[PDB]
Design a binder for this molecule. Structure first.
Ligand code: XKF
Lengths: 115, 112
């Protein structure tokens, strides 16, 4: 089972349904089930990486691709006033699924601090 | 147009530098929102993530690898949050791409 057996691995393999925005060989973008803004989606690698703190050096281009995909999808969804991208690491970061994921939130004014 | 982050890269104004290489700089935020709050920025002037080029994808990933290495070196073993802001809704404060890294406290949800 490529993708791992976190819930996000199951979404990658189409075992659990999701509302998918974009898909390529490297990643998947899909809407969050508990949105915290009018638009709130995730971009994840298809390669299982548990958390950013254990990402390999040669995962650099993949991580960058999540961001590029994130910004493209935000444009395609009409987030013309802007958005916030978030990666959570570990307990203090609020990480709830141990498969790396980029949150993209928009459609309202985001506030400071970012939690 | 130039920004304060350009001035920091050029060493024209002071910042507490954590790490530097040929293509990025990491430094503590002047307005920290957590006990540890630093930025990782490219030396290339990309004004905002929305205008990043495809060719920039490994540079962007390099910011996050540098960020996670710096976080480890700064002792953030209980975790942290990485943030990129875009535009007015995103609360982007400087029009030079920057990755925020915050930790040393529980970060909350929603992330603003
Ligand atoms: C999209 N579909 C989907 N999404 C899920 C599910 N189960 C969790 N997800 C989504 O994945 C994100 C993981 O976030 C974090 O790991 N940190 C974000 C902050 C956070 C999440 N949980 C916390 C708990 C405490 C503190 C902070 C957090 C969340 O925004 C969830 O809504 C799920 N099952 C079946 C289908 N599911």
């Amino acid at each position: 089972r490529p993708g791992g057996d976190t819930i996000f691995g199951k979404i990658i393999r189409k075992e659990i349904p999701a509302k998918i925005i974009f898909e390529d060989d490297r990643c998947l973008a899909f809407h969050d089930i508990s949105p915290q803004a009018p638009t709130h989606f995730l971009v994840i690698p298809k390669k299982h990486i548990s958390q950013i703190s254990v990402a390999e050096d040669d995962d650099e281009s993949l991580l960058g691709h999540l961001m590029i995909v994130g910004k493209k999808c935000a444009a395609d969804l009409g987030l013309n006033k802007g958005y916030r991208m978030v990666v959570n690491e570990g307990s203090d970061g609020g990480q709830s699924v141990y498969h790396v994921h980029l949150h993209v939130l928009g459609g309202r004014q985001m506030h400071w601090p970012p939690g």
